[PDB]
């Protein structure tokens, strides 16, 4: 009855959102996936076909089906060039400006499906070799696939043939981070209260690899883990114990972190290190806030970003803009924040949120599971929801510029 009453309100608000998209966006593409993806990550490569008004980008996706046909998925996405005529095809519209037919929108196509054992909790590519993808599986195993050592047609036998099997966990999780400074150093967060580290740099890629180190500082489900982008020894973890922990791999004590902070009034689901500001990171929580942190003084939260109406599961810094970050979760909203606007006055403009809230994306009518900033096209985001919708979108230049 409350899922029934919510559903009708959602539809009210979605109709109004579709109304306003030309005003709020420079790009909106919607694609219904065969199955919901729990995960999204842009691959770093773009190809710009010599003669065309679009470039080809790729996404790491996964499936979430309770049948036995789960796939790790690579999809292609055509996006307009910086040099290209702005028209109605940017809003999934083939209407000509002067009647008749205008232009086709960019295409979204499945390039590769690889048999996967259970749903794909999360999938991340290795920075030093984006052909290598790690996955979180319900089994508690982390799987590694080189997607170039597999057919693009999935094996009809239904067998999963991962290039490596990473042991060390007793339960599933979501958190997964590759060390961008030490090739093949992988962290994983688990419902078993532990963080596993593997070094696959030496191993020949179908054997089983045991965890090099297991970190036991948390007393509850570890939700997320992330390496520092500059300091090869430093990583953060967040957990259902409401703690942000900062770890140093040089320490011999794997039971106690370098720093432990009481970060939130509920579970901490996600963290992200600022790729331009080496002291700065953000955490997202079931307390419906994003917290801003300074590694130099973790006693004191710098800021609390408030506007979400439900649990936050993902937070990600803009790869292009040091003041820009985004968050998503169970309220079916993706908020874009500008920390440069903190403390500004506004024209009660002030009625509909704090000044550091740059943009609310209301495109999704189901819970958002994951999202990825396009690293090659500023302000493009891919977001995926539990209903199977994938959206590739870009707020209007006038909103940021």
Swiss-Prot record:
Transmembrane segments annotated in the record for this chain: none
Modified residues (N6-acetyllysine): 153
UniProt-recorded Gene Ontology molecular function terms: histone binding; histone deacetylase binding; RNA polymerase II cis-regulatory region sequence-specific DNA binding
One cellular component (GO) term of this entry: chromatin
Assembly information from the UniProt record: Binds directly to helix 1 of the histone fold of histone H4, a region that is not accessible when H4 is in chromatin. Subunit of the chromatin assembly factor 1 (CAF-1) complex, which is composed of RBBP4, CHAF1B and CHAF1A. Subunit of the core histone deacetylase (HDAC) complex, which is composed of HDAC1, HDAC2, RBBP4 and RBBP7. The core HDAC complex associates with SIN3A, ARID4B/SAP180, SAP18, SAP30, SAP130, SUDS3/SAP45 and possibly ARID4A/RBP1 and ING1 to form the SIN3 HDAC complex.
Segments of this protein annotated with the region Interaction with ARMC12: 1-125
Crosslinked residue numbers (Glycyl lysine isopeptide (Lys-Gly) (interchain with G-Cter in SUMO2)): 153
Keywords, in A-Z order: Acetylation, Cell cycle, Chaperone, Chromatin regulator, Chromosome, DNA damage, DNA repair, DNA replication, Isopeptide bond, Nucleus, Phosphoprotein, Repeat, Repressor, Telomere, Transcription, Transcription regulation, Ubl conjugation, WD repeat
GO BP term, example: negative regulation of transcription by RNA polymerase II
Effect seen on changing residue 121 to A: Loss of interaction with ZNF827 and loss of localization to telomeres
WD repeat residues: 25-118, 119-168, 169-215, 217-262, 263-306, 307-362, 363-395
Tissue: Expressed in neuroblastoma cells.
Protein name: Histone-binding protein RBBP4
């Amino acid at each position: 009855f409350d899922d029934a009453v919510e559903e009708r309100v959602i539809n009210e608000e979605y109709k109004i959102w579709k109304k306003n998209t030309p005003f709020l966006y420079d790009l909106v593409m919607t694609h219904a996936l065969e199955w919901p993806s729990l995960t999204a990550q842009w691959l770093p490569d773009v190809t710009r076909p010599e003669g065309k008004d679009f470039s080809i980008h790729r996404l790491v996706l996964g499936t979430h089906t309770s049948d036995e046909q789960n796939h790790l998925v690579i999809a292609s996405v055509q996006l307009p060039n910086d040099d290209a005529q702005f028209d109605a095809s940017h809003y999934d519209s083939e209407k000509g400006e002067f009647g008749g037919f205008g232009s086709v929108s960019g295409k979204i196509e499945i390039e590769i499906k690889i048999n996967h054992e259970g749903e794909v909790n999360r999938a991340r590519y290795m920075p030093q070799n984006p052909c290598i993808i790690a996955t979180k599986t319900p089994s508690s195993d982390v799987l590694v696939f080189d997607y170039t050592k597999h057919p693009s047609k999935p094996d009809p036998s239904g067998e999963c043939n991962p290039d490596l099997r990473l042991r060390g966990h007793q339960k599933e999780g979501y958190g997964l981070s590759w060390n961008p400074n030490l090739s093949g150093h992988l962290l994983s967060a688990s419902d078993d209260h532990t963080i596993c580290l593997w070094d696959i740099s030496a191993v020949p890629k179908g054997k089983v690899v045991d965890a090099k180190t297991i970190f036991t500082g948390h007393t509850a489900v570890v939700e997320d883990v992330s390496w520092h982008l500059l300091h090869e020894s430093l990583f953060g973890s967040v957990a259902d114990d409401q703690k942000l922990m900062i770890w140093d791999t040089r320490s011999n004590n794997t039971s106690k972190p370098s720093h432990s902070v009481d970060a939130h009034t509920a579970e901490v689901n996600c963290l992200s290190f600022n790729p331009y500001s080496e002291f700065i990171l953000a955490t997202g929580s079931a307390d419906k806030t994003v917290a801003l942190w300074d590694l130099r003084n973790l006693k004191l939260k710098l800021h609390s970003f408030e506007s979400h109406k439900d649990e936050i599961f993902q937070v990600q810094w803009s790869p292009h803009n040091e003041t820009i970050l985004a968050s998503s979760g169970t309220d079916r909203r993706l908020n874009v924040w500008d920390l440069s606007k903190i403390g500004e006055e506004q024209s009660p403009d002030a009625e509909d949120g704090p000044p550091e809230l740059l943009f609310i994306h209301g495109g999704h009518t189901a819970k958002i599971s994951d999202f990825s900033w396009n690293p090659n096209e500023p302000w493009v985001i891919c977001s995926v929801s539990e209903d199977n919708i994938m959206q590739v979108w870009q707020m209007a230049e006038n909103i940021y510029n």
